[PDB]
Amino acid sequence: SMNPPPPETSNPNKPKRQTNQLQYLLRVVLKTLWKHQFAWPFQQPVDAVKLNLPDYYKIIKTPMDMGTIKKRLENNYYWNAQECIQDFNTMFTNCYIYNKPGDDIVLMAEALEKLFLQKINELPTEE
Numbered sequence: 001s002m003n004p005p006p007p008e009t010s011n012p013n014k015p016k017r018q019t020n021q022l023q024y025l026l027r028v029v030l031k032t033l034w035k036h037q038f039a040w041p042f043q044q045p046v047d048a049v050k051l052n053l054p055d056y057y058k059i060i061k062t063p064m065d066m067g068t069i070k071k072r073l074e075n076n077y078y079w080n081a082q083e084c085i086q087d088f089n090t091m092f093t094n095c096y097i098y099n100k101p102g103d104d105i106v107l108m109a110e111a112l113e114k115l116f117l118q119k120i121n122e123l124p125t126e127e
C-alpha cells in the first residue's frame, strides 16, 4: 500500500547540543557509510510502492534509513550518540527482519554493518 511519511528529522521543541561523538557520527560514520558501494538502498526510506513491496510497512513499524540519520545529525536532533547508533542498528535489523538471510540485499546490509561496527569501535571518548 502507501508509504508512510518519513521519520521526523527536526523538532524545535527538543533541546540541542553538539558533542564530539555526534560530530564523529556525522563527519566520519555517516560520511563513510554513505560512500560505500552498497549504500544506495539505504540512503532513503524504503519506497515500498516503487520497489513493489506492499507488505513492507505491514511488517516494519520502525523504519529508518541513512537519509533520515543524516538529517537528524544535521539538525542536532539527537541528544546523545546512543540515540543515533540505535537508528543505524534499527536500519540493519529492519532489513534482516524483512528479507531472507543470504539475499543479495541482506549481504549488502551485513557488509555495511561490518563497516559501521568498525567505525563505532573507534568512537572517541566523550570529552
Ligand SMILES: Oc1ccc(-c2nc(-c3ccc(F)cc3)c(-c3ccncc3)[nH]2)cc1
Binding pocket: 040, 041, 042, 046, 051, 091, 094, 095, 096, 098, 099, 105
Ligand atoms: O529494510 C529494507 C528492506 C528492503 C530493502 C531493499 N530491497 C531492495 C530490492 C530487493 C530485491 C529486488 F529485486 C529489488 C530491490 C532494495 C533496493 C535495491 C536496489 N535499489 C534500490 C533499493 N532495497 C532495503 C531495506
